[PDB]
Amino acid sequence: NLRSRPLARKKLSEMVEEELEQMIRRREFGEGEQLPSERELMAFFNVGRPSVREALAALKRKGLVQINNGERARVSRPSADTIIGELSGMAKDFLSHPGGIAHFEQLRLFFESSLVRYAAEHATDEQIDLLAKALEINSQSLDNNAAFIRSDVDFHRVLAEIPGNPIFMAIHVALLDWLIAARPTVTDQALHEHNNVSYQQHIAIVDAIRRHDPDEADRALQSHLNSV
Amino acid sequence: KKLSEMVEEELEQMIRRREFGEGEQLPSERELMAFFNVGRPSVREALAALKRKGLVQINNGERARVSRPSADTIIGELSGMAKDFLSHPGGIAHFEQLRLFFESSLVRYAAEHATDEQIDLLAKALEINSQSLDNNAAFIRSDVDFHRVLAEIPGNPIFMAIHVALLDWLIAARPTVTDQALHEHNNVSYQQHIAIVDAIRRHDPDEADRALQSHLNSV
Amino acid sequence: KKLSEMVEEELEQMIRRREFGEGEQLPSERELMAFFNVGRPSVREALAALKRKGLVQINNGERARVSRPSADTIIGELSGMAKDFLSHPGGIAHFEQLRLFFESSLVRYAAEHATDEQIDLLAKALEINSQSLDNNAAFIRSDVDFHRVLAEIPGNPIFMAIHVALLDWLIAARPTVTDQALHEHNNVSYQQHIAIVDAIRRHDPDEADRALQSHLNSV
Amino acid sequence: NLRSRPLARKKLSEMVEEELEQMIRRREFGEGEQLPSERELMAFFNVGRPSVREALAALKRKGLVQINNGERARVSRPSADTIIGELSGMAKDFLSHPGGIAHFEQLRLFFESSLVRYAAEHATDEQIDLLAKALEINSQSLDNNAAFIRSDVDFHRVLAEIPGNPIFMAIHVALLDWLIAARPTVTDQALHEHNNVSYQQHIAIVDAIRRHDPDEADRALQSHLNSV
Amino acid sequence: NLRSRPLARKKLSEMVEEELEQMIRRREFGEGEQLPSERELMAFFNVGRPSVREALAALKRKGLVQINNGERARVSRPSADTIIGELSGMAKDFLSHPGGIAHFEQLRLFFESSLVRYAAEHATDEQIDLLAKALEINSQSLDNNAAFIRSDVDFHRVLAEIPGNPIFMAIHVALLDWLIAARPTVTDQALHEHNNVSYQQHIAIVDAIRRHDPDEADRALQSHLNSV
Amino acid sequence: KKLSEMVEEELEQMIRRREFGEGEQLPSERELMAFFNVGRPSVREALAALKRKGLVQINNGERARVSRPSADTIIGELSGMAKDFLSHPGGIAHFEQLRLFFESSLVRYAAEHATDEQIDLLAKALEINSQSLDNNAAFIRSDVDFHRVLAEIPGNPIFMAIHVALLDWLIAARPTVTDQALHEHNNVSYQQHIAIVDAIRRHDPDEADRALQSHLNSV
DNA sequence: TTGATCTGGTATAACAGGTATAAAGGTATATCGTT
DNA sequence: AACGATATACCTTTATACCTGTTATACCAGATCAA
């Protein structure tokens, strides 16, 4: 450890991991694979090989580096996706106990209402083409299977991408994944009429956005979320 | 892929299914490894990940246990997230903007189902909120209590958790606080809350949203 | 040429010769490379090709295994092929025309060797086929069951595979289905199947082929 | 990746390959070598050189580009030949187990009967010259070795080319290759008389086609396939 | 070229290739990739990049180096296989004109008779186990297809490997390849009885070798080559 | 793999099929490349390989032609092969041993079909062979003429080519020749050839093979 | 003598192979607990 | 006090990524031939 300090009983792995943390915080490395390999650091610190592996693995969990296969660690910063990855541990309890299912629906409804209100209020002359091509590519009836579902979720994503906030897209993807993960026994009984109703509601929504009237858009969105 | 994450999620869902309660009820990890056809460092990495999460307790050579409280992981995630500040100077305001997208989803709900049982509660809350006198201690406590009783109107435990999380996040983020400017800030805040509760009584969510937007713009 | 394809076909024929069963029975790929005088990226490309095909399983650092089921490559090829639609508008009908070249090779075979043991089977099949009532669920199932029991007359496993492949291909190709027109469609279909089985009993393959051509032209 | 996302443990090669797939599907490239070289894309994505090589190689297998030697990738569409190339993996089992040999023969017989019926029914006044010159160039007895075999397979090919379906010629070539690949110990014992019988049967077939009588043609074809 | 000599009209590629030849003959390099890459030599000689590529390519043809993929040239010596590779250009004429087919058969017969005579005369007490295990693994009747053919050619190879001459194995492999390349329409009509006759003849050959009587072995080999 | 070798073998088989005779009958290589979907350096490498082989002739900017004589490639291969001498000191004797495996396949053939028409030819050959007097000039010429008339007994053009190739190879390999020892060498050679022709007349291939082995062992 | 075409050489780009590094899994050893 | 089980650490193997080298293709320049 370049300082002659064993620290065996007090877990010497903490010493090397905090030394690596300090060396990274000292702005002595770049943003990629500037850090050496495992054997180089092992020989430089006169320690074991599995210790450095555990250190890096713990560091990745803490959200500091990233490794894939046959490449050194790439130092980065913990973004919004890292927080969502570290979370979701208690999400199973919410779907386990009877409640919470309506709470997630209410949260999603509030989020979508807020974002559609912001989009209708800050409606520029360029984002109209995005929603136009979205409703155009989601207008034809060619595949009544899962293609319409992915088209609808892509339309929702491009609608949520209007503000331009990295945390917004992250939480949107997280909520959509947590919602589609709790859809058991999906059957194709009345999904075609559901697709037609969704198309009509999207047409009404874009018409209300063009006319600058969030009331009708909010009513159509509430009706769509109540019809499920 | 990586075996580690597989057995990690397996033991996570096992401890979530309430298969083992308090104490050292887990079997020997050697025969677990022999049955799962995994490696020794994988189990050590899984235990280290669980220790970093804050669910098990390993000191010397004893076995792991369960952890019912969840306050350690909260401050852990707080310290881990409150770091991305020097990268984006104004992007933090985006996070503040997120708070907007939350509060605007609250003042427009009082006119939905609140009839009289919540009106008395918010009135008796704002009574003490206005009776408060201290600028740094009483006014901040009154403001957070008003925000809590506002978030508790729909009756949702997730909303309260999100609100307190945003509160502690902004508290850890903002490093400098004022006293003279905060006085007029909370003054205008409760002056606008008066109009907010007036519009709530009159069943007009537009005026409440406008007052909230003006309060957020006043900073 | 490319060394990769050579060792790929070599390991393919080796795993087809049943040299190694289930599990990690393959030796170390390092000495394999040393004996074959090949390169490191070639082995990685071969393993990636085998993973894309759906015969091996590599997640992290373990060894490859064998894969007995073949349902993943089926849907993989389905998704990979069901794409050339916007290039040729009517050329897809050519594929449908191919189906003709298959069905015309079936109705002309019942008069070859089927005497009575298949007649009872097709009769008890068409019984339930006509007893079906639902337009979108029962009629389509009855039609595919009749097509299956027709293709199973010569007793050929390849014919059944080709038939089910054409079925799933046309299902993935056609994006819009009807209910009112499909009713009369299957009505005329079984009305022509009546004449088809009559001609089969009378040992006349010409009338069956004419009825099949008329059914295909009716769309 | 122009988005600051490591994705090391989750195989970053999938990220770049799906990015390339999306860029190709966005109709931002032509149909040839419009895509840049390996070093250009490597420097643009700030990734490794072997990663882009593996991506392109995987893409070629999926059936999207094509490379030869010293030339950029040519984007195209997976035709019928690509499906046959991706298949044929289970064809060895059929020739391994005792059955299947008669099944392939029955399939080929059904295909040839259907195509000859279509040719006799849609017989125009122009395709007659093709079969005429075919039987003329396959009439003289100059080389009794493998020249007659290739003449016969060329006659079969030009007969199968009458409908004009790209998938038809593809499956015909595939079946002929899979059939000639399973002809062990080909000896020249009675191949001359076989050539004479084949010539007489082709004469009978073209006569039945001229007379518009598929029955005699089908009988002659059945006799030829039974005589082998 | 380190000497200030253009030699443009007289093909300067000859100058650099003869300089490389002299540098190699000066015993200044080892036996592997000791020579630098293409860019290093290009910058050292102040010439073009394709010129060095053509030089190395010509050198490989001359039989001096060897390249595969992503590796420097490995200097070696032209062995017997290089001569066979450079030859075989006029072998197509022999199979084109009617003669020569019996000439190759006579040459192969002379070669096999000479090698079997040498093996029977220099029969030691160790090579008997090789032929014993060969005839043992070629005795069972498990696959009457091409497995017996490859077993027979492996037996012929291990029989030709008795003297221990690198040129002998090279010319043996060359002759066997040139002979199997001229086997058109191989059919499985009487190959099983041919396999039984070959097994009996190999038994007679090994018995004559044990008894030290090359006459019976030569007669059996002549009968086998006449039966084809 | 390498495109170069493909088009090289293609043009080789094309010029072997006698598609183009003498002169510049080949078309423009630009449209050849456009039709073959190859590169420019590949055609240059193929032309360089053909020039090194000795089939085409390119000096400045003209087109390639055909080459009927094959004497240049002979000496080219001779110079290219006569180099591996310092590696294996005694392995060159293996090559000499190969010559054995050739000559032993000749003396045992005279008793097969030669009746009298070849006996007179070999007799009138050995007449002048013995009439020769010079040690370095006449005896070597007599020996090579006797070897030629021996190899020409079965009537095979390939055998003569192989014999002359071995002759020029051994001539280029052996750098030192003697005169006094070569005298007794050829003396014993023809003294053994006397017994060889005697055994050929008596129809006894064993004695001829023994005499040939003794001559080869005498060196 | 000038212009055009063809051939050859050089340079650049792309693909493939090999090597190195990192991560995961398995095995062994040590420590703690229970009988 | 001894034995067994569990946990942690270390080592080895496999996979992935990056870099380097080689080959092929394209472009430019020079030379030769024809008008």
Residue numbers in the entry:
A (entry chain E), D (entry chain F), E (entry chain C): 21 to 248
B (entry chain G), C (entry chain H), F (entry chain D): 30 to 248
What does the paper say about this structure?
The Escherichia coli GntR-type transcriptional repressor, NanR, regulates sialic acid metabolism, but the mechanism is unclear. Analogous to other GntR members, the NanR monomer has a two-domain architecture, comprising an N-terminal winged helix–turn–helix DNA-binding domain (α1–α3, β1–β2, green) linked to an α-helical C-terminal effector-binding domain (α4–α10, tan). Here, we demonstrate that three NanR dimers bind a (GGTATA)3-repeat operator cooperatively and with high affinity. The effector, N-acetylneuraminate, binds NanR and attenuates the NanR-DNA interaction.
